[PDB]
């Protein structure tokens, strides 16, 4: 309507195109798979030990670092597999962050700090796209791992995914599409209250502009849903709880399984996290 809100449309469009380039499996594609509507993907359903073994062809367990984890018992292999998907998520999120206007002009130390605290909140936000109450798409939608199967793993691995499923059923109720999520994840990255930020001001400047864009996007894209903007900001704190819980569980897992080691990218992110 006006030049000010016109600039917020361009920003929303820029972030959407950037999100499409950065993330191979979008919520649009993910939802098409989960509802059965014809797609490239035939997801092999993993519901038990036997199905996982018969489905090893379709899951790339082969790429997990380090290699000795690839030989271990099922629960450790599944956990490491989920953690490894997170490594590939970090790379995609990092490339997306670089496309956010003003982000690469921030103090490089602050770019590192924003990503370090942002990535898992974004991982679990976007994972909700791949989830229903029954299970989660894995290996770019070539696998579907059942919720019950992930519940059944021995302690301390038995409930590591339950908090993500519980956050996902509520979050997916908002019926956000890719274009909304593209702006929401940029808002999460540009959080001025992360510990050890050197220069908060230019981060809050960028986030203020992203939040306005997100608000305009949720007015236009969901004009019949009225307080969608307000409900979404409440979730940004439910996300932090998931990440604190996940890091705490990872601490338990590292100390109960003393000869488990993590991908060095995850070691560097998890170190001095909550």
């Amino acid at each position: 309507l006006n030049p000010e809100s016109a600039d917020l449309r361009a920003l929303a469009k820029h972030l959407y195109d950037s999100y499409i380039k950065s993330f191979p499996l979008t919520k649009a594609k993910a939802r098409a798979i989960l509802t059965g509507k014809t797609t490239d993907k035939s997801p092999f359903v993993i519901y038990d030990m036997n199905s996982l073994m018969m489905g090893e062809d379709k899951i790339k367990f082969k790429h997990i670092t380090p290699l000795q984890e690839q030989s271990k018992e099922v629960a450790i292999r599944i956990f490491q597999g989920c953690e490894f998907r997170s490594v590939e998520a970090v790379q995609e999120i990092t490339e997306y962050a670089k496309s956010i206007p003003g982000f690469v002009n921030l103090d490089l130390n602050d770019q590192v700090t924003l990503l370090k605290y942002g990535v898992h909140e974004i991982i679990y936000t976007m994972l909700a796209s791949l989830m229903n109450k029954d299970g989660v798409l894995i290996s770019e939608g070539q696998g579907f791992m059942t919720r019950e199967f992930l519940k059944s793993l021995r302690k301390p691995f038995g409930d590591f995914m339950e908090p993500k499923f519980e956050f996902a059923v509520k979050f997916n109720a908002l019926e956000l599409d890719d274009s909304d999520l593209a702006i929401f994840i940029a808002v999460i990255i540009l959080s001025g209250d992360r510990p050890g930020l050197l220069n908060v001001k230019p981060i809050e400047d960028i986030q203020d502009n992203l939040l306005q864009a997100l608000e305009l996007q949720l007015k236009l894209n969901h004009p019949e849903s009225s307080q969608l903007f307000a409900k979404l900001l409440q979730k940004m704190t439910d996300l932090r709880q998931i990440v604190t819980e996940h890091v705490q569980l990872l601490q338990v897992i590292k100390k109960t399984e003393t000869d488990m080691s993590l991908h060095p990218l995850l070691q560097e992110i998890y170190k001095d996290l909550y």
Binding site: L108, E268, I269
Partner: peptide, 11 residues
Amino acid sequence: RHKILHRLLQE
């Protein structure tokens, strides 16, 4: 240091 993150952000 965050060597890998630094490297992801510079390439």
